[PDB]
Amino acid sequence: SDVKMSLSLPDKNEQVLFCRLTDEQHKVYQNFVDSKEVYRILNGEMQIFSGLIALRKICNHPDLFSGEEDQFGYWKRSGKMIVVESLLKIWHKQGQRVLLFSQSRQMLDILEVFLRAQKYTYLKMDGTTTIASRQPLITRYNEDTSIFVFLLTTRVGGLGVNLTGANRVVIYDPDWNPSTDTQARERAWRIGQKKQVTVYRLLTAGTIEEKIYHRQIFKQFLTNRVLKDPKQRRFFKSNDLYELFTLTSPDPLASSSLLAKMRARNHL
Amino acid sequence: MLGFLSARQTGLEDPLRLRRAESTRRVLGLELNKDRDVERIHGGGINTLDIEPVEGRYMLSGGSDGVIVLYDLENSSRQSYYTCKAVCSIGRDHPDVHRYSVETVQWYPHDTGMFTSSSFDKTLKVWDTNTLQTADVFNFEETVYSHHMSPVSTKHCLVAVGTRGPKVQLCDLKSGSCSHILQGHRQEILAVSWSPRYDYILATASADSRVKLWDVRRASGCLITLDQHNGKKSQAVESANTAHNGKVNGLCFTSDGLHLLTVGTDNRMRLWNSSNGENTLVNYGKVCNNSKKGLKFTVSCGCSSEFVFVPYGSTIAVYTVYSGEQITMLKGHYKTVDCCVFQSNFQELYSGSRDCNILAWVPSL
Numbered sequence: 001s002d003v004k005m006s007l008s009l010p011d012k013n014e015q016v017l018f019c020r021l022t023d024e025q026h027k028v029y030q031n032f033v034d035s036k037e038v039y040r041i042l043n044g045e046m047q048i049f050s051g052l053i054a055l056r057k058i059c060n061h062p063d064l065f066s067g068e069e070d071q072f073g074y075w076k077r078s079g080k081m082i083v084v085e086s087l088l089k090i091w092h093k094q095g096q097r098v099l100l101f102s103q104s105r106q107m108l109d110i111l112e113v114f115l116r117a118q119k120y121t122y123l124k125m126d127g128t129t130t131i132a133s134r135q136p137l138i139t140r141y142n143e144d145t146s147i148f149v150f151l152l153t154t155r156v157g158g159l160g161v162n163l164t165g166a167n168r169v170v171i172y173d174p175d176w177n178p179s180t181d182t183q184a185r186e187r188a189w190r191i192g193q194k195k196q197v198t199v200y201r202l203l204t205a206g207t208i209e210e211k212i213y214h215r216q217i218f219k220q221f222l223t224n225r226v227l228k229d230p231k232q233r234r235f236f237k238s239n240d241l242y243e244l245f246t247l248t249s250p251d252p253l254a255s256s257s258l259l260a261k262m263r264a265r266n267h268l
Numbered sequence: 269m270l271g272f273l274s275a276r277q278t279g280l281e282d283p284l285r286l287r288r289a290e291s292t293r294r295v296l297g298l299e300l301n302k303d304r305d306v307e308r309i310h311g312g313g314i315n316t317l318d319i320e321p322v323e324g325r326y327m328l329s330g331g332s333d334g335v336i337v338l339y340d341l342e343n344s345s346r347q348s349y350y351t352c353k354a355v356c357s358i359g360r361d362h363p364d365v366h367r368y369s370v371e372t373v374q375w376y377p378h379d380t381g382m383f384t385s386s387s388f389d390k391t392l393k394v395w396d397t398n399t400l401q402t403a404d405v406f407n408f409e410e411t412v413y414s415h416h417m418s419p420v421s422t423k424h425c426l427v428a429v430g431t432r433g434p435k436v437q438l439c440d441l442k443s444g445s446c447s448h449i450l451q452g453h454r455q456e457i458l459a460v461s462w463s464p465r466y467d468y469i470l471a472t473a474s475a476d477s478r479v480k481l482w483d484v485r486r487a488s489g490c491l492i493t494l495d496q497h498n499g500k501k502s503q504a505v506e507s508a509n510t511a512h513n514g515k516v517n518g519l520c521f522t523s524d525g526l527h528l529l530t531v532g533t534d535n536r537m538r539l540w541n542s543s544n545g546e547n548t549l550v551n552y553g554k555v556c557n558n559s560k561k562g563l564k565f566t567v568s569c570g571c572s573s574e575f576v577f578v579p580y581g582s583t584i585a586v587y588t589v590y591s592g593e594q595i596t597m598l599k600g601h602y603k604t605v606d607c608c609v610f611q612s613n614f615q616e617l618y619s620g621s622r623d624c625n626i627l628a629w630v631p632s633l
């Protein structure tokens with residue numbers, strides 16, 4: 001912001017779409033939050049991780065109960081995948097290049113299958129790809145615009161690489177750490193980006209994903225409290241308790257300036 | 269001396285000659301004051317004294333009873349006999365009085381409008397001298413043995429604090445940051461002293477028999493560790509390279525800041541090249557001290573030869589810094605002397621001891 005005017009970067013947008021669980025996805029989510037495992041979690045008997053990861057998987061796509069055109073990972077069974085399908089159609093008809101992130105390798109494979117189901121020319125880079133080929137791959141996506149979508153895991157696709165060839169960026173799945181999402185979204189808006197970029201951060205409304213978004217907003221506020229200014233507004237959207245298992249789908253100083261500063265600090 | 273005046277008038281000798289020669293002669297003629305007295309207000313022993321660096325008029329004194337007394341040393345009366353009256357007092361009735369003994373009190377350098385006092389009540393309080401109210405307080409997890417502000421820093425305003433913790437704390441009086449610590453000692457840090465020459469050089473003496481010089485800007489620990497032998501008994505640095513054979517409970521940079529005087533509980537004082545910590549092997553003989561806390565001793569300024577005034581039992585031992593020759597014993601205290609502070613303007617001395625007395629030593633004639 002203090003360098004953007006002195007660097008001639010293009011415009012940026014940071015929209016946050018609140019996606020809607022499908023009937024089948026909502027059914028699986030409601031069945032899980034009504035299951036006995038989450039009940040045991042809320043009683044402190046079991047670790048929270050199983051339920052947390054299960055809910056995140058359900059919001060990503062119902063790959064718990066793998067339900068032709070009914071193969072594993074079919075796009076129409078997940079709301080976020082429906083939104084991604086619409087966005088990819090629009091952007092492809094607009095002749096733009098998209099950077100599709102995911103927290104989960106399995107969800108990245110599902111997105112890859114959905115992309116081959118369409119005619120989109122993709123290019124994938126996750127933790128399994130050999131390191132020696134990663135910088136080449138990036139260069140490929142930065143060089144020829146025939147490649148449309150760049151699939152990424154936020155841990156490898158983020159974190160310092162340059163992907164200015166990408167124009168749109170879509171963060172498919174929120175993470176507990178805000179910084180993962182931040183670096184993933186700044187993979188495109190960098191020195192050398194000659195086109196307007198926008199970030200679409202997909203969350204399922206009233207699910208665990210919205211709660212994770214709230215947790216990481218709280219974390220971002222805590223960070224801004226000490227990085228940019230200490231007048232940060234308190235996080236009031238939620239109390240951040242252990243009720244994220246619920247489905248709530250919508251719808252020289254001369255001793256005077258120094259003494260004055262001591263008094264100022266102490267009166268606070 | 270008429271020779272000195274004649275040489276000054278005739279330009280034979282620079283007036284510097286007369287000034288420093290007469291300062292040295294005055295220091296040598298130091299004796300119990302014939303016509304001067306200091307008001308008695310401390311109910312306990314005086315652990316520390318500090319005359320303000322600018323104008324040298326006012327003196328702070330912290331007692332073992334926790335009170336802090338502010339004296340005026342100027343003879344505002346017309347008589348030749350006067351008592352150094354107490355201007356101000358953090359007494360037992362003050363809301364911010366120290367609950368335990370005040371162990372170090374120091375005027376803020378560059379300005380007399382503020383001072384600081386550290387106590388065994390685990391607090392370093394910063395006082396506004398005008399309102400006489402605590403402008404700030406720094407709390408520590410362990411009792412403070414000593415503290416010191418840099419007498420030179422126009423840039424930083426750090427207070428180096430040595431507590432019974434093995435860490436030297438650096439409290440920023442600019443926006444209050446007491447988090448900075450220096451690692452490398454192993455027992456209580458009984459003395460700390462900023463270099464008068466170098467802005468960011470701090471010497472710290474701890475009960476582990478080691479004295480370390482730190483560049484507080486640096487990220488790599490101490491610069492120099494003082495070694496008695498300079499390398500004759502050389503060992504991988506885990507327990508060797510000790511400054512003394514006991515607890516090093518006092519530090520004092522010389523006036524120019526090119527040497528460092530360390531007094532330890534092995535009944536020895538040593539003089540160290542402040543640039544590489546090499547021992548200069550100046551003898552000083554046996555310097556009796558057994559203090560379990562920091563020992564406050566000062567050096568002379570503005571004289572032909574530098575002197576060091578060390579508490580020696582119930583006396584003040586005056587030594588020549590660079591030769592070690594024993595000048596004299598100022599003998600007027602009834603208990604062990606805790607501190608002595610040197611007025612450089614008139615070559616005067618003020619000593620506080622456990623007998624609840626502050627004695628003034630003035631040159632005779």
Ligand SMILES: [Mg+2]
Nearest residue numbers: 159160161162
């Ligand atoms: Mg980088």
